[PDB]
A paper describes a structure:
To provide a structural rationale for the multivalent effect observed in the enzyme inhibition by TPIS, we first determined the crystallographic structure of recombinant Lscβ in its apo form. Moreover, the first 16 amino acids of Lscβ do not have a counterpart in the EtLsc sequence. Nevertheless, this N-terminal region of Lscβ was not introduced in the model due to a lack of electron density. The active site is structurally conserved, with the catalytically essential residue Asp62, the nucleophile Asp219, and the acid/base catalyst Glu3038. Furthermore, the residues that compose the substrate-binding site are fully conserved with respect to EtLsc, and their side chains have similar conformations and orientations. The two active sites, which are deeper compared to those of α-mannosidases and do not face one another in the dimer, are 55 Å apart, a much greater distance than that between two iminosugar-ending tails of TPIS (roughly 25 Å).
Among them, levansucrases (sucrose: 2,6-β-d-fructan fructosyltransferase, EC 2.4.1.10) catalyze both sucrose hydrolysis, with the release of glucose and fructose, and levan synthesis. Levansucrase from Bacillus subtilis, Bacillus megaterium, Gluconacetobacter diazotrophicus, Erwinia amylovora, and Erwinia tasmaniensis was extensively purified, and their structure was described. ,− All of them display a single domain with a conserved five-bladed β-propeller topology. ,, Comparison of different levansucrases shows that the architecture of the central substrate-binding pocket is also conserved. In particular, the enzymatic mechanism of sucrose hydrolysis and levan synthesis involves the action of a catalytic triad including two aspartates, acting as a nucleophile and stabilizer, and a glutamate as a general acid/base catalyst. To gain insight into the binding mechanism, the X-ray crystal structures of the beta levansucrase isoform from P. syringae pv actinidiae (Psa) in its native form and in complex with TPIS were solved, confirming TPIS as a competitive inhibitor of levansucrases.
Author numbering:
A (entry chain A): 20 to 431
B (entry chain B): 22 to 431
The structure:
Amino acid sequence: INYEPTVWSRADALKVNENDPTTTQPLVSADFPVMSDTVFIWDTMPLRELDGTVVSVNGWSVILTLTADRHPDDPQYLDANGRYDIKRDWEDRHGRARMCYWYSRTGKDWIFGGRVMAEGVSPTTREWAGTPILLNDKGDIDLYYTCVTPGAAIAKVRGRIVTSDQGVELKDFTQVKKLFEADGTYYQTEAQNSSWNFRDPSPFIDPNDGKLYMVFEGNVAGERGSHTVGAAELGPVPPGHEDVGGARFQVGCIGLAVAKDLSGEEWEILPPLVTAVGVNDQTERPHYIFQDGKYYLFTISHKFTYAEGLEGPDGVYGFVGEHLFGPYRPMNASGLVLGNPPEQPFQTYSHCVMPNGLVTSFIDSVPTDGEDYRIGGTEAPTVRIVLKGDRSFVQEEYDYGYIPAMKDVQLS
Amino acid sequence: YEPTVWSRADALKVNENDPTTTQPLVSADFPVMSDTVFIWDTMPLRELDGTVVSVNGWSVILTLTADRHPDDPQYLDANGRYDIKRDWEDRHGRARMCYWYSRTGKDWIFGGRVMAEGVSPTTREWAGTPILLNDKGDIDLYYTCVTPGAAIAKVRGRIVTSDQGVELKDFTQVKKLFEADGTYYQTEAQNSSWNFRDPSPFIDPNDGKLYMVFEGNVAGERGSHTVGAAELGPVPPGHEDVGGARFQVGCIGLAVAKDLSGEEWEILPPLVTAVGVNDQTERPHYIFQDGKYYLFTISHKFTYAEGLEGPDGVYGFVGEHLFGPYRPMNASGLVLGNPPEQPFQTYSHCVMPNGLVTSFIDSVPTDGEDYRIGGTEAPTVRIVLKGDRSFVQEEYDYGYIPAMKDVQLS
């Protein structure tokens, strides 16, 4: 299987408008509530089927979160005056990340369910994001996730959900199987770049050929600093935008893999679907909506992972087309689907666009009086978007962490 | 077929600050082509497939033209001050078609009036398209006769050339082809500011029939139109109020000819409508490229409805079928906008199939809070089209309109 990737060019990124009211996330309130005073949560992963549908089980909604403890009373984060450095505690989350689950009858007011896997089950101490798939009405679940440090592998672990009128348990996630890692020909490896990105599996059944595929975040293969920013990467920039500076250091891509069969036990990597060399280093958490005969491929990125000479917000970006292997076109012409507002540029991250149009994200940093800011580590308000052809439009907002079921599955 | 709606929600995506869709700045010291006439809307000689053509090596353009009056007491105050801005605003009622020619596609030589005074049924001769019909030099000039009423019309004539230049001759009998009907397009009785003008004929690349697009307004008594869900589109919270938007009712119209002679026309329903968005979708014209129909139209900042903001310049809609549906170029519709620091520098853009875009100079700011009037050609600029998007490229000299193909007369 061979196909050329869709290039997200610099010329495309010069169309990004951070001030478009149709593509701006609503402002998060400075007095947002926090789901936990003992843990931070961030990347949130709704339970779903391989076709994309977000599901409850026996009337319980279930989400997985990356989770790290809070350390307010810990001397290493306390200065001479006993002030707590929450910002540093929050920045330290990534090395402590573990998968936990939460549940609710209502799609909000989440009840903590605890760790998915016992400590030591994961091959790496870090357990980074992926997708929990409900496989059947017996309650079997495949959790696809990323094992990081040493190395980075996309992995899966099988377990089960059981419920009662009192709540949910996830059990028996006891054997992790690594599936694949970066190869060095299509996707950049650790030996080529110790800051390589390789993570966030999103598995699905393709609506057209019915095979099991996954997309994931990668980087375009090649030694750090070797990539070329040539015509394709620059695109048809206007006069005075020819200089790229050190843009060749930014090399994000959305990757694709295909399973040998529908069990998803053996995978083969395919070439990059969408590349952003010279544009942005991080095309994170890629995921699809299948709607109106089109593939809508969304990906999250940061203002500060852009190449020199470009400006855009943290938030959701997207590419659309009629065929799984492309070519794709940038949503809203620039690629930007939902950007943080410029007055609160880091208020939310790790958005997940669900097929009902609702978009969930977590709160990162919200400005407060005195040119300060508060840390979130909790769910943001959900907001709905509508897709129309190659364009999107932001609509109304919902409560914090609202993630309703699209379908309820009753267990056998 | 149902029209494509350009909605308010689409228009809220218009970005006046995008470097890929901004016209280059016009220099304060631009040259003027004539110190005796203003020119504005410029119409290159072309074939019915869109190709811009020279004839025996001569490029030819038509312009709307009006005299300048710098020594006329009606524009002069007691102190000798010349009200050029008023003279320029008064051009519309003095408009006549003239032609110009050049071996080089610039440094245009004045050819004079196309039609003798009195040939046109109306004194005003407003814009359209000159079509070179064959290698004998026959030409159909499609144009608009305005006041009283507004009719799309045509007049047949011919071009002859020599080593010394070009003549356009024998344009002596105008035939009116059609006017607004009142069910598809708005009429004078429904709105005395009705828009109905600017014919752009072409042979469709798919069915081989002769059609034309033109500027209209959606039919209905002034003030009666509804700005409902389709016109509003999926606006975000806080953008529900439309104020007086139902008074802005621009559309791009379509008509079809009985046969390839283009002597008898039937109107068809509007292709693209902008009720509640903008009153003026002017000079519609196509490029046929990459299996698509790119339909461009020019509009003004000051013809937008309340609650919307966009620049003077070129807008566009793209699709795969003549009858639609079409999608707005660059998501918002904007293709090339004037820069916000010189918002009225150019107008009446004509995108040619080689990507070059010609426009005229209107007003350019100068030293102080002052400005200069144009009435002369602006620098040509090239755009490139990529799917449903466009990107501005390099600029060329003032009024550069090179031929795509030369036709030797037999």
